[PDB]
Amino acid sequence: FKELGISDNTVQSLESMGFKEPTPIQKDSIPYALQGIDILGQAQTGTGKTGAFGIPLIEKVVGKQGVQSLILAPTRELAMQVAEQLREFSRGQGVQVVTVFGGMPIERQIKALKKGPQIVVGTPGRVIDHLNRRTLKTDGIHTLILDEADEMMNMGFIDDMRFIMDKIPAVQRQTMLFSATMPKAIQALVQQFMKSPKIIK
């Protein structure tokens, strides 16, 4: 992990979890992530690839104020799994991770967001609710990650993804998109809302 250029503190967090050896997707993705480049990852669905974006994210967000990164996921289950992996990658570092998803009363989520977590993981329709209420502020969002974009499209979120990517300023934003398949509409997200991304398969 040290050789991939990860921070000393994140190497310590990973060692404390027993995460010793990077997977092939992590070796391929992490150096580019650290360089600030956008990433298009064609990868298997679920949590095996979370480290590829999550590990280098920690040193980017740690210690800062306000929401620094937004990760979109198709489901509560994946959002919660990804959030828990991010708390493991950052164990001991004090990085606050909040999950927002639909089908829950919004008040509790609003209280969590007011505490200023550094990473928000959420489902797209509920993310939009927060954006429009101004309970999720966009001013600090310098990393936007779409996890399982095709699944998000399957679940009815294509217009929500387009809205979110357009609403959040791109000038100092790193964007990553992970999907097992690339439907036409997802191709269009890459075209309109990403910066010449590096391709990882």
Swiss-Prot record:
A motif (DEAD box) lies at residues 147-150. ATP binds at residues 43-50. It is found in: Cytoplasm. A motif (Q motif) lies at residues 1-27. Belongs to the DEAD box helicase family. CshA subfamily. Oligomerizes, may be a member of the RNA degradosome. This is DEAD-box ATP-dependent RNA helicase CshA. It comes from Staphylococcus aureus (strain MRSA252). The lineage of its organism: Bacteria, Bacillati, Bacillota, Bacilli, Bacillales. The gene is cshA. The chain holds residues 4 to 204 of 506 of the full protein.
